[model samples]
Target: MAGLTVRDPAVDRSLRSVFVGNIPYEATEEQLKDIFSEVGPVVSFRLVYARETGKPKGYGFCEYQDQETALSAMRNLNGREFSGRALRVDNAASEKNKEELKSLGTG
Candidate 1:
């Protein structure tokens, strides 16, 4: 449940957002959305990538319309394999908080 890294700044969407990792480079937004939609409606999503070469970063964030749906997504998709890669999912804020904890010597 560690090593979740995405360079995006924190946001208020954490309650309704999740960070998804281990994505296949070839995976498309439509496919990713389809998979997450199984848990609930996807309100917004962003598949990360290198801006210069446009290469996939194999991670992103998906947001739901509500907190329950977001939690459901985390539980359902966190370890599920997609395109031969096991997805890593977590609540957006907790992911950032983990880093803060290390910095604060709380870990």
Candidate 2:
């Protein structure tokens, strides 16, 4: 399971994305949008690729439209098959620790 990033969301609201891997390295934005949208609304997809070959790095990011949907995706879709392989999903795990720091004060 990938951990959340150390960056705080209150500081930078770009944490709505999740890391996805274990699928083929040929994923496209349209395919990502089609799948992630099934859990909820997707904001965008950032597919990791090699600068040398321009091929996907077998990983990418799917930014959710909201945290609620993000959580939903991780629960419902993680470990499910995408392209004949099981996909692993998780928000930067570090977010949980940072979340306490911010939520303790805000919530």
Candidate 3:
């Protein structure tokens, strides 16, 4: 929340979601949900996919019902092993901001 002050029309509760990286190429939203849902209630999830081939981009976002769950997921999942890969987790809004800036031609 500290670095996420830029407002995006599409992002609600920007601090409630965490970005997950280094995901296995085969990981699905349902699998991610099952992994994180154990920490708390997951509100929604958005897995990035290649624009041309429609394949997952090896990263995604997971939104929880609140910041606590998001923080918990980040703390627990960061550097954790899953499917033989180490996961990277961070505040989703920051990644969204970067993407939004790219879309705006400012990145």
Candidate 4:
């Protein structure tokens, strides 16, 4: 991976949205939502689940009502332990999809 910094685009930042990882499989959506509620109003929350087996995927996303609340979450809740495991909280869009564009401009 290159360390060169890239300029930001005009698109809206996902500052109010976060990716929650390392969630306990036994945790329910309501339970996770209650945890995030400590930071601020949660606009939306979704815990990924397997459609075939109907089991939690141990990760999810949370959208706060505002940027400040999200930032607060990053500071206070990023490494906060939940159900005996440390939670991983980050900006949802921080990770760039790394798939190669093999079909683009090659014809």
Best candidate per lDDT, number?
Answer: 1
Q: What is the full ranking by lDDT, best candidate first?
A: 1, 3, 4, 2
Which lDDT tens digits does candidate 1 get at residues 1-107?
A: 23576465344456677877888989988889898889998788877776688777787878888778888988989899998999988886685834633343333
The TM-score obtained by model 3 is 0.74
Q: List the residue pairs that clash in candidate 1.
A: none
* Winning candidate number (TM-score): 1
The residue-by-residue lDDT of candidate 2 on 81-106, one tens digit each, is 98886877777434663353233232
Those runs of model 2 whose alpha carbons end farther than 4 Å from true positions after fitting are 1-15, 93-107
| Span of ten consecutive residues with least summed lDDT in model 2 | 98-107
Residues 1-107, candidate 4, lDDT per residue (tens digit)? 13556475311235577777778988999999899999999888877777788787777777888777877888878899999878887765564310111111111
Q: TM per model?
A: 0.75, 0.69, 0.74, 0.74
Error of 1 at 22 (Å): 0.4
Cα-based RMSD of candidate 4: 7.5
Give the per-residue Cα lDDT of candidate 4 at 104: 17
Q: Tell me how far the alpha carbon of residue 19 in candidate 2 is from the true structure, in angstroms, after superposition.
A: 1.2
